[PDB]
Ligand binder design. Structure first.
Ligand SMILES: O=C(CN1Cc2ccc(-c3nc(NC4CCOCC4)ncc3Cl)cc2C1=O)N[C@H](CO)c1ccccc1
Length: 345
């Protein structure tokens, strides 16, 4: 078999001429020539069966992405694994190959207002579909937005995604959380388990802000520093928004802080389109109940040149699947079952 940077890449006969793309905790990714469709593809090798939480992510990723079909959501084209559970140590997930991601693009490229508008439109168009399936992405960030050579955008990495559960969203103050720090909504640190659609809109707000300046808007250096940054720009919460936080630890923390005034968006972003800043403000609302929803965001005047609800599809039914209690050994079985459709047969 072909190897790349040490690892065996058992992807043939269909996929040949591998080039290394990158690596992480997930595994390793290469481009490969697909000998059926005659295009290069992305292939990521995942080796998760020795820890339950890698199994969870892999299964969430697989189940969600096979059910979803949308232009602004990365699909799964093919999955390669051994023919038996016993022999299955790796899963190879085949996906459309994208030129870059919004993280890499933001470190080197100034975005025109027309690019920001188009990228924001596509994020929200994909997110409309996600939310319509009652799913929360929960880790939206520049590196999870893939881009092709014509700036078409696809949301990727559904391994932290959850079915929405707003009746069980409440928790205590400083309750530990998994998703990416700079894009975490203020309520995560105060009283939310991150089980409502509003968590994703916050992350989109952060991404909008970052597109306007090429710098993260709330670059907290650790867990409660993240609220420090947030409140440094939004200013102190209003009496009404505070009264919505019934948890006493969280409310009294907020009351203990000196009063801070709102930094106006147009001084933080002096060159930004004023409509973009109005939408930003509505996505970066402190109170999650008052935060704009995806369909409202799409209908915002900033996006008028693209808004077309008949061309912003929704999912055919809500998604349902839970996984926290299931062992490593059951999750292997489910990944095996979920990938069977791709086997010769
Ligand atoms: O799978 C992932 C996360 N990842 C990693 C990755 C790498 C590359 C591409 C990708 N990249 C490109 N092009 C690139 C060209 C170079 O510039 C950048 C873009 N084109 C297409 C794709 Cl799909 C996509 C992904 C993705 O979704 N994590 C699973 C589930 O959470 C997981 C499972 C178990 C434990 C931990 C995590």
């Amino acid at each position: 078999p072909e190897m790349v940077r040490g690892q065996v890449f058992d992807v043939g006969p269909r996929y040949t001429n591998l080039s290394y793309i990158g690596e992480g905790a997930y595994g390793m990714v290469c481009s490969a020539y697909d000998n059926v469709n005659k295009v290069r593809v992305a292939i990521k090798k995942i080796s998760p069966f020795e820890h339950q939480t890698y199994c969870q992510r892999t299964l969430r990723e697989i189940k969600i992405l096979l059910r979803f079909r949308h232009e602004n959501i990365i699909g799964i084209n093919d999955i390669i694994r051994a023919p038996t559970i016993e022999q299955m140590k790796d899963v190879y997930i085949v996906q459309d190959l994208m030129e870059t991601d919004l993280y890499k693009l933001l470190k080197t490229q100034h975005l025109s207002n027309d690019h920001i508008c188009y990228f924001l439109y596509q994020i929200l168009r994909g997110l409309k579909y996600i939310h319509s399936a009652n799913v929360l992405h929960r880790d939206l960030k520049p590196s999870n937005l893939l881009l092709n050579t014509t700036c078409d955008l696809k949301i990727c990495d559904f391994g932290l995604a959850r079915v929405a559960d707003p009746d069980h969203d409440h928790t205590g103050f400083l309750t530990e959380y998994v998703a990416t720090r700079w894009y975490r909504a203020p309520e995560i640190m105060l009283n939310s388990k991150g089980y409502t659609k509003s968590i994703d809109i916050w992350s989109v707000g952060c991404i909008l802000a970052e597109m306007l300046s090429n710098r993260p808007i709330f670059p907290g250096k650790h867990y409660l520093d993240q609220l420090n940054h947030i409140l440094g720009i939004l200013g102190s919460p209003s009496q009404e928004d505070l009264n919505c936080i019934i948890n006493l630890k969280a409310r009294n923390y907020l009351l203990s802080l000196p009063h801070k005034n709102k930094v106006p968006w147009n001084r933080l972003f002096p060159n930004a389109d004023s409509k973009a800043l109005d939408l930003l403000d509505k996505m970066l609302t402190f109170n999650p109940h008052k935060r704009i929803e995806v369909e409202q965001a799409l209908a915002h005047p900033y996006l008028e040149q693209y808004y077309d609800p008949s061309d912003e599809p929704i999912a055919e039914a809500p998604f349902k699947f839970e996984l926290d209690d299931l062992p490593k050994e059951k999750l292997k079985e489910l990944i095996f079952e979920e990938t069977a459709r791709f086997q010769p047969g």
